[PDB]
Write an enzyme that holds these catalytic residues in place. Structure first.
Site: not given
Ligand SMILES: Cc1cc2nc3c(=O)[nH]c(=O)nc-3n(C[C@H](O)[C@H](O)[C@H](O)COP(=O)(O)OP(=O)(O)OC[C@H]3O[C@@H](n4cnc5c(N)ncnc54)[C@H](O)[C@@H]3O)c2cc1C
Ligand SMILES: *[C@@H]1O[C@H](CO)[C@@H](O)[C@H](O)[C@H]1NC(C)=O
Ligand SMILES: *[C@@H]1O[C@H](CO)[C@@H](O)[C@H](O)[C@H]1NC(C)=O
Ligand SMILES: *[C@@H]1O[C@H](CO)[C@@H](O)[C@H](O)[C@H]1NC(C)=O
Ligand SMILES: *[C@@H]1O[C@H](CO)[C@@H](O)[C@H](O)[C@H]1NC(C)=O
Ligand SMILES: *[C@@H]1O[C@H](CO)[C@@H](O)[C@H](O)[C@H]1NC(C)=O
Ligand SMILES: *[C@@H]1O[C@H](CO)[C@@H](O)[C@H](O)[C@H]1NC(C)=O
Ligand SMILES: O=Cc1ccc2c(c1)COCO2
Length: 514
Positions: A455, A493
């Site tokens: 997280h 979460h």
């Molecule tokens: C293994 C794991 C289990 C987890 N389990 C839970 C849980 O059960 N419940 C919960 O609430 N949280 C959980 N989390 C945490 C939660 O899922 C994340 O904190 C949250 O999804 C992050 O969202 P985001 O939009 O910040 O990033 P992301 O959802 O990772 O989105 C960023 C996106 O940008 C893309 N990207 C990156 N750089 C570029 C670029 N230069 N050009 C184009 N695209 C790019 C990536 O490929 C990705 O698709 C978990 C995390 C992980 C890793």
């Protein structure tokens, strides 16, 4: 107010294109960088009124079917990272194995499915003027699409009975709210084990207005009265492409805690002395880009019950202000799921096991993201979290580990002991057991056996890099919406908070513009 059991809805693939298609290049009202947790609902929301391009570096989840079921979770972490897989492996400079998503839907396609709303005190702690009624409406929009009330799972019921016996009160029954006590929360896994994810929120977009490019690696934000005007992105063949925003439109970075600060630094938004030292032309000096990067510690024990237990997804939470606890039960494996244990040299279980876990809130310890390459976005940046550099975090782990001690001593868990002896040495452990109950042994245990909770957040904070409307300070037509934006976890979460935040900020952009 909640989803039903149903197949993963890929209808949105009718407007998903390969980034090799040059007819995607041109002018849009909005460009959203990163088709993840925040990015998908944001792009879907803006597309209700405006022409939107969503650029995602990964492919579509149909290519990796083990992302679409509960029982595929471990498979995705076990799979070698060949640069194309939905799970990208990294190791922090602290030495702790970790992963991030590389796939349309982002980390919601690979995560453990646990759904919760933000702590209702979080909003007032931020000092942002939130529209709190709209926040709640936006939670229901997400929940109605992808969240279920989970069915009974025997191991989760054992753990919930144990949390209650160990003093984690009150009994909150079934609730999505982050509140003190023991509860059943929501899941993005449905009652058939089908994964639901942020990509399905693209189905709420207007299919005449939304276009999604996959295998689109965004390398640079283009600038003009300093304004964002566009992006450069490369396709899977390595050819370059440009897209632009027009009129009162905006570029939004949703590339995650790691991707967002990386792209901002590569684009010359960041600390003047740091960028100048790399010979990156400074477009906007800001000493905080890639600063205040946080990873909540995961500390754990593993029990090997003498009779088999049935595998479960996490649905039952034990919440105190100073620690957040859960447990999953798992089949054994002979390939380690990368980052479940902090290194690849961790003993593998030969029988079913319960992973029993405590998360430090906050955390107060932080580090940074820096560039590994000054030119290539496909090269992962360096990241360091400084686990337990802040003594309050260590103090909170000690409290959590003593509570896991109480949990193992409950009548609820007694039937999972190998030996009917009085103490918790009656369990069989995989890896290091809990300690002695002076503070010093618990401190050593915390420091030595820490893993990522996954997280991680920060790197482009509201109050440091962004204003209260998620705008990059000093730059017109540029915003950031993702887990890079807040220094402290909104709950145990946070996927529910970031799903909500994508749509919420989209609605704020549409309102500002109206
Ligand atoms: C293994 C794991 C289990 C987890 N389990 C839970 C849980 O059960 N419940 C919960 O609430 N949280 C959980 N989390 C945490 C939660 O899922 C994340 O904190 C949250 O999804 C992050 O969202 P985001 O939009 O910040 O990033 P992301 O959802 O990772 O989105 C960023 C996106 O940008 C893309 N990207 C990156 N750089 C570029 C670029 N230069 N050009 C184009 N695209 C790019 C990536 O490929 C990705 O698709 C978990 C995390 C992980 C890793
Ligand atoms: C995009 O097209 C290239 C061939 O130009 C191919 O190698 C790649 O697999 C395609 N990607 C997707 C996501 O279809
Ligand atoms: C938002 O919903 C929460 C429960 O998640 C409730 O406690 C709160 O009062 C609601 N707030 C408003 C402004 O409706
Ligand atoms: C930056 O460029 C200057 C030449 O203009 C050079 O002297 C210096 O070594 C360069 N630094 C790096 C890290 O490339
Ligand atoms: C909710 O957040 C508030 C304010 O930050 C804090 O006092 C409280 O401990 C949190 N509640 C839980 C159960 O974490
Ligand atoms: C880049 O990453 C390598 C290998 O992970 C690391 O050891 C090296 O020091 C990094 N280089 C820079 C410039 O940060
Ligand atoms: C820990 O964080 C606190 C509160 O944010 C900060 O003031 C303090 O300097 C840090 N403590 C240590 C031990 O570094
Ligand atoms: O990889 C399988 C697995 C087994 C137990 C477990 C988790 C993943 C996530 O955290 C909580 O407990």
């Amino acid at each position: 107010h909640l989803a039903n059991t149903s197949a993963h809805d890929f209808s949105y693939l009718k407007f998903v294109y390969n980034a090799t298609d040059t007819s995607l290049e041109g002018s849009y009202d909005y460009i959203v960088i990163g088709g993840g947790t925040s990015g998908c609902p944001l792009a879907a929301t803006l597309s209700e009124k405006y022409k939107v391009l969503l650029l995602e570096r990964g492919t579509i989840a149909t290519e990796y079917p083990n992302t679409l079921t509960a029982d595929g979770f471990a498979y995705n972490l076990q799979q070698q990272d060949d640069g194309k897989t939905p799970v990208e492996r990294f190791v922090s400079e602290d030495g702790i194995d970790n992963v991030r998503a590389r796939i349309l839907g982002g980390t919601t396609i690979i995560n453990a499915g646990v759904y919760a709303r933000a702590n209702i005190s979080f909003y007032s702690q931020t000092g942002i003027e939130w529209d709190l009624d709209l926040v709640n409406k936006t939670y229901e929009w997400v929940e109605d699409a992808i969240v279920v009330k989970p069915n009974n799972q025997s191991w989760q019921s054992v753990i919930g009975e144990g949390f209650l016996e160990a003093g984690i009160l009150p009994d909150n029954g079934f609730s999505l709210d982050h509140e003190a006590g023991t509860r059943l929360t929501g899941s993005t896994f449905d009652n058939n084990g089908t994964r639901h994810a942020a990509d399905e929120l693209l189905n709420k977009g207007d299919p005449n207005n939304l276009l999604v490019a996959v295998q689109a690696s965004v390398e640079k934000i283009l600038f003009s009265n300093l304004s964002a005007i566009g992006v450069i992105y490369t396709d899977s063949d390595g050819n370059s492409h440009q897209a632009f925003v027009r009129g009162n439109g905006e570029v939004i970075v949703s590339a995650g805690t790691i991707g967002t600060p990386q792209l901002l630094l590569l684009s010359g938004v960041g600390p003047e002395s740091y960028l100048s030292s790399l010979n990156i032309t400074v477009v906007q000096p800001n000493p905080y880009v890639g600063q205040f990067v946080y990873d909540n510690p995961r500390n754990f024990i593993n029990i090997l019950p003498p009779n088999p237990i049935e595998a479960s997804v996490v649905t039952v939470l034990g919440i105190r202000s100073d620690y957040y606890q859960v447990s999953a039960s798992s089949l054994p494996f002979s390939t380690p799921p990368f980052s479940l244990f902090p290194t690849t040299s961790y003993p593998l279980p030969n029988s079913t096991f319960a992973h029993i876990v405590s998360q430090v809130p906050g955390p107060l310890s932080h580090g940074s993201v820096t560039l590994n390459s000054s030119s290539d976005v496909r090269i992962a940046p360096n990241i360091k979290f400084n686990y337990y550099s802040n003594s309050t975090d260590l103090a909170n782990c000690v409290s959590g580990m003593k509570k896991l001690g109480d949990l193992l001593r409950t009548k609820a868990l007694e039937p999972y002991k190998a030996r009917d002896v009085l103490g918790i040495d009656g369990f069989n452990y995989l890896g290091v057991p809990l300690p002695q109950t002076d503070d010093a042994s618990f401190e050593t245990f915390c420091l030595d056996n820490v893993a990522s909770y996954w997280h991680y957040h920060g790197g482009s904070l509201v109050g440091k890099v962004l204003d209260d409307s998620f705008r990059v300070m000093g730059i017109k037509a540029l915003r950031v919406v993702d887990a890079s934006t807040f220094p402290y976890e909104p709950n145990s979460h946070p996927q529910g908070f970031y799903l909500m935040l994508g749509r919420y900020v989209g609605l704020q952009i549409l309102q500002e513009r109206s």
